[PDB]
């Protein structure tokens, strides 16, 4: 719905996707329909990007949450600098946070179990502040994203 472009909803999507990547399913009601659709599409993109950019991603060391945040923001700035927003690009934001959390799992100097909650936070900040209005104008997650990507 229209409120799904606010921070809390986006944060939950970003956190759900990281928990998917880290293989830690949380008990309870289960992920939303949006999150269920997003996890499949984002993961497919993530594995493609990990293959296409493997030589490059191996030359970056994600050793702290602060390095993950700076790198994420640097990459997002360049990805979106042409002013174009579309649902495919929004999916890649989740794919990239999944790449970052996997690198952190291996490389983080002082690992902390709450790190994926910090990553999710700065991902939601970027999505809301830089794409939130476009998301709302295009139907939000329920009437835009899910309609584009759910099964036929």
């Amino acid at each position: 719905g229209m409120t799904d472009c606010e921070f809390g909803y986006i944060y939950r999507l970003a956190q759900d996707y990281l928990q998917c990547v880290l293989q830690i399913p949380q008990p309870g009601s289960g992920p939303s329909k949006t999150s269920r659709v997003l996890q499949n599409v984002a993961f497919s993109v993530q594995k493609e990007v990990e293959k296409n950019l493997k030589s490059c991603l191996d030359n970056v060391n994600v050793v702290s949450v602060d390095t993950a945040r700076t790198l994420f923001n640097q990459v997002m700035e360049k990805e979106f600098e042409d002013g174009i927003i579309n649902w495919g690009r929004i999916v890649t934001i989740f794919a990239f946070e999944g790449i970052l959390i996997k690198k952190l799992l291996r490389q983080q100097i002082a690992p902390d179990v709450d790190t994926y909650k910090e990553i999710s936070y700065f991902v939601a900040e970027f999505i809301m502040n830089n794409t939130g209005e476009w998301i709302r104008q295009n139907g939000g997650w329920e009437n835009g994203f899910v309609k584009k990507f759910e099964p036929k």
């Binding site: 599409v41 993109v45 493609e48 990007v49 296409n52 950019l53 490059c56 991603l57 030359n59 970056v60 790198l71 640097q74 990459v75 997002m76 700035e77 360049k78 990805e79 042409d82 174009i84 579309n86 649902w87 495919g88 690009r89 929004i90 999916v91 890649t92 794919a95 990239f96 584009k148 990507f149």
Partner: peptide, 21 residues
């Protein structure tokens, strides 16, 4: 350079997914 390469790879993948998804 690595920032630019990663960003360009993500942009390309997203624009491809947009048209083929």
């Amino acid at each position: 350079r690595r920032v630019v390469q990663i960003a360009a790879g993500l942009r390309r993948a997203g624009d491809q997914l947009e048209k083929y998804g």
